[PDB]
Structures are given as structure tokens and as C-alpha cells.
Amino acid sequence: GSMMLSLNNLQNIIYNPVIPFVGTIPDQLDPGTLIVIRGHVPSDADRFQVDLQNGSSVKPRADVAFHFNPRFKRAGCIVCNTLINEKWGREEITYDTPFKREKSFEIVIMVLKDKFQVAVNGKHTLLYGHRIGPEKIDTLGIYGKVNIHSIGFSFSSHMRLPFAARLNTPMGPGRTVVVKGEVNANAKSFNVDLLAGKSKDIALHLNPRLNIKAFVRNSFLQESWGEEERNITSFPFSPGMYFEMIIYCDVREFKVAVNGVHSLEYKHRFKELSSIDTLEINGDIHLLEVRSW
């Protein structure tokens, strides 16, 4: 189905680099970091490569954690490998290659904990397991017959609070909103609200109060708070704790789950679901990510 993703990135972008290019990565490649390379294959090209390197020495040649090497002779392919102490390890070749001479491309390399995940032109292309710890990578190299228009790095970052957004599509049965974050180590309470944007009514007010371990829910209708609902089996939050809160819109009620566990249900008071079109989030957390489908 269709889904929305919302987040903050620190971005570091290099326009029009000259090839061959040897550049220092602006920061460490922690899991979740993207590298985005945009370019074009010249008509006369046989190959080019992108190398994630440990330094830029040439003699002895810098270790290459990730050598990503599209080739064009024959039917084409992408060669991948790692160079350690001037020795190439075992070679991993992918034959479903999207690269073509005289065609533009976008490479997206996601740096995961255990591997690199690479997509070209919006479609998945290959995985590549780490052989060198990714934390040892501080240099990017691009060599061969290729034009590069930009090289971009994307680093994850905490979203600014208070957070306030219109959803692209309103609530309704089967709609789902996910809030990913981290409770402050110093935290007292935080709030997640679903509003009717126009009337400023709050259909669902989610309010974990860590100081007293109470998960409070309410609605703000006709310009006044209603009866609070606090009934809970256990309090699923703690300071310093990562959390995934899922809010599912059912016909009769919202259902909320914290970390994969169903935590509470809340009967709809504001029943025009398709008028619930705004999300607000604030308080003592680090907001990491918001998803809705």
C-alpha cells in the first residue's frame, strides 16, 4: 500500500566533482547512513567504480571496504569486492545490472549494521556483507569513465519539537500512525495528539507521564477536556528507552501498541474520522521518525 515517512536528515552534498575523485567522508558511516551518487555513463565507457576506503594511501594502497564496480562489456554486470592489505578477497558479481552506456543513474547505498544495501534508480540491486568494520571507512573514491553530478551523504537526526503536521490522508478504519522515538533520560512526560485541524478539536490525546507512570488519554472537544482514561496493564515506557508507538484506527476505537505489544484501546468520541487530519508531538522525548499508512 501507500505510506508516509517523516524524519530529519543532516545532509552533506558535493556538486560536480571531477573524476577521478578522492574525498573525505564528512562523518562516520553509522547504520542508517545513505550515500547518494548521481551521474551518467559516457557512450565510450567500459567501467567505473565507487570505492569506500580506509584512507587514501596509494603505496601501500588504502584498504577498500566496499569496491562497487559496474562494467559494460558483453551484457554488463556489477563487480563487488573488498581490498585488504593490497589483496582482493572473493569477488561478488551481480548480473541484473541497471547501468547502461549513455544513461543517467542514481546509486543509493544504505549502510546497515551487517551489510551495505544498494539500490539503483529506485529499485533494489544488491546486498554486500561487511568484511571491514564500516567505522573504518573515511574516504570515498570514484574512478573510471563516468560523469558524477553529485555525491550526497545523509545522516539521521532528531526531529525538532514541537512537531506538527497535516497527514496527507485523514484517519479512517484501517489507517495506522507510527511514532518512533526515545524517551529522554531526564524525562517527565510527552504527548502525541491526533486533531481535527480545522476545528482544533483533539480526537485522541496520548500522554504518557513517566514521573508517575500513568498513560493518560482524553479528547478535547467543544473546547474542553473530557473524562480521562488511564486503565493500563503496565506502563510501557521508561527514561532513556527507545520506543515504537503504533496507533491503529479501527471502526469503533483507536488501538495503541507500544513495542509490538497491544497496550490500550480508546473508543472514538470524535466520530468523524475523516476530519482527523493533524498530528502533534511534543514533550520530553527525542523524535526519530513518524510513519503512517
Binding site: 505510506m3 495506522t176 507510527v178 518512533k180 527507545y242 515504537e244 503504533i246 491503529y248 488501538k255 501498541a257 513495542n259 509490538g260 505489544v261 497491544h262 521518525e289 510513519r291
Partner: peptide
Amino acid sequence: PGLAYGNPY
């Protein structure tokens, strides 16, 4: 998508 803990729903 991107859920360490799954989804009950």
C-alpha cells in the same frame, strides 16, 4: 516497515 518490534494489528 522499519519496526524493530512487530505490529499486533
